[PDB]
Design an enzyme around this catalytic site. Structure first.
Site, short mmCIF file in Angstrom:
data_model
loop_
_atom_site.label_atom_id
_atom_site.label_comp_id
_atom_site.label_asym_id
_atom_site.label_seq_id
_atom_site.Cartn_x
_atom_site.Cartn_y
_atom_site.Cartn_z
N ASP B 90 0.85 -1.22 0.00
CA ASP B 90 0.00 0.00 0.00
C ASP B 90 0.87 1.25 0.00
OD1 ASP B 90 -2.09 1.88 0.26
OD2 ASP B 90 -2.97 0.95 2.05
N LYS B 92 1.07 3.79 -2.18
CA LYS B 92 0.45 5.08 -2.55
C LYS B 92 1.43 5.99 -3.31
CE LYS B 92 -0.70 5.04 1.80
NZ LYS B 92 -1.35 3.76 2.24
N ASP B 95 3.65 10.75 -7.25
CA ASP B 95 4.53 11.77 -7.83
C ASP B 95 4.82 11.49 -9.29
OD1 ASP B 95 6.23 14.13 -7.92
OD2 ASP B 95 7.40 13.43 -6.22
#
Ligand SMILES: N#Cc1cn([C@@H]2O[C@H](COP(=O)(O)O)[C@@H](O)[C@H]2O)c(=O)[nH]c1=O
Ligand SMILES: N#Cc1cn([C@@H]2O[C@H](COP(=O)(O)O)[C@@H](O)[C@H]2O)c(=O)[nH]c1=O
Lengths: 258, 258
Positions: B90, B92, B95
């Protein structure tokens, strides 16, 4: 009503982290943040030492280090103290409060123990900030909210950006500014840091877009340029850093009138 | 027409990782993803071993481990193969493509080397996917786009959600589904994974919101429940896992018609 960095450092509502930063920016005549996107601690530390005098801030991605340890961080702090710059871990916290609290304090990186500044995406709602705030630390720490992004197709626009600004203003005890492409807040107590900066027009092959220091600082009203490849991929890194520093500094001076 | 997990595994346009997942879901009669947000490697492994038979997937936050090493992941791989579940980190990613590529392939965690699945926020635009895909595609890894979040004040709504779905559909060679609160795509080749699940109504003190398995799978049309505290905090973790599994499984069966 446009104030120097040094004057902004003294504003009544200024956060201590922001004040510290602003003071050193003024002292050193630099509003350049080095993005030290490297794979080895040795290189990170070399950069920090060589370019320390030219920068107000060193931005890390500690997860890209092949050989991260807290000992590395200890060494970095020493350099930061020596050369006078802040450490900003570009962690992009971006989940529920309960999770980010743990990601900030704990685990392998122990970010809160060494990073003057971190950043967060606003997409989860204000819980992302609240979680970070719940980390107990008797040290001066600040957070930057990502209000705009530098990349093609960024969704950090319009109402999203406004949401970020509101969230910042509502958590000013901790949030000291923004990652943005421009000035997004009219409140001078907030810092604006802008990535996607190079002397030349262009981008990369993966959605990065570049604007110049004059454009970002001068025209768009940001405070600090974040520069990675423009420096770290340069044939002469110190020379490059000095060009960027001088560019950003003069662009800033241009706003102060007289 | 609503298809079983097993049937979905056979769809022409199914991604291999998705097919693997769907098959084991059907085999094991589980659509439960355990979220193991633990501070010790030993605890991660202990939980994975004990609960493996009850889960289709284990969701990690390797950065929260005080004692992460690649050897920990070696051991997790062994458990995942033994018990038959996928590993979802996880992470995430959130960018520019150039950066996330590095964060996925390299550094301390070498995520791509062991994670079947990772997730990404869509806020940076599609470059985030492009960067990850360069690493993951030829390794038969998959990615989930965060289309909705479980937390109070989430900005992952409306047009944002729609953007995530479009991005997914346009990168279907790599993107296998979503983190969402509900069914967001009508395409059955895509998986929907939903955090913010407990048997009981409520939340936490940091903006997490909970809905029941029946609500999220049955009513809202998601595929897989992601449950952390609801299991981990229980006296009897095994019993708890079983309760969650049975709840999610029955809710799924309910959609399958006469
Ligand atoms: N938040 C945020 C952002 C962070 N960054 C980061 O700033 C750096 C830009 O590096 P470069 O393109 O090499 O000058 C890199 O570490 C990247 O991850 C952005 O480029 N854009 C953003 O919008
Ligand atoms: N993307 C994403 C999300 C991830 N998660 C993660 O799922 C887990 C929920 O854990 P729990 O609330 O303990 O059941 C936790 O690890 C959290 O970081 C969400 O709760 N909501 C999201 O929207």
């Amino acid at each position: 009503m446009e104030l120097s960095f040094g004057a902004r450092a003294e504003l009544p509502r200024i956060h201590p982290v922001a004040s510290k930063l602003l003071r050193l920016m003024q002292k050193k005549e630099t509003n350049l943040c080095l993005s030290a996107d490297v794979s080895l601690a040795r290189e990170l530390l070399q950069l920090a030492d060589a370019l320390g005098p030219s920068i107000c801030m060193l931005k890390t991605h500690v997860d890209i280090l092949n050989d991260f340890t807290l000992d590395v961080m200890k060494e970095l702090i020493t350099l930061a103290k020596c050369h006078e710059f802040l450490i900003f871990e570009d962690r992009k916290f971006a989940d529920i409060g309960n999770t980010v609290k743990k990601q900030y304090e704990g685990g392998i990186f122990k970010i809160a123990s060494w990073a003057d500044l971190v950043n967060a995406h606003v997409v989860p709602g204000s819980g992302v900030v609240k979680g970070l705030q719940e980390v107990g630390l008797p040290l001066h720490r600040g957070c930057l909210l990502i209000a705009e992004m530098s990349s093609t197709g960024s969704l950090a626009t319009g109402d999203y950006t406004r949401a970020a600004v509101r969230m910042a203003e509502e958590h000013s005890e901790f949030v000291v500014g923004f990652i943005s492409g421009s000035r997004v807040s009219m409140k001078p107590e907030f810092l604006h840091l802008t990535p996607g900066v190079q002397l030349e027009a262009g981008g990369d092959n993966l959605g990065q877009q570049y604007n110049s220091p004059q454009e970002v600082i001068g025209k768009r009203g940001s405070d600090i340029i974040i520069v990675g490849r423009g420096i770290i991929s340069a044939a002469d890194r110190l020379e490059a850093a000095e060009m960027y520093r001088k560019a950003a500094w003069e662009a800033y001076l241009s706003r102060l009138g007289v």
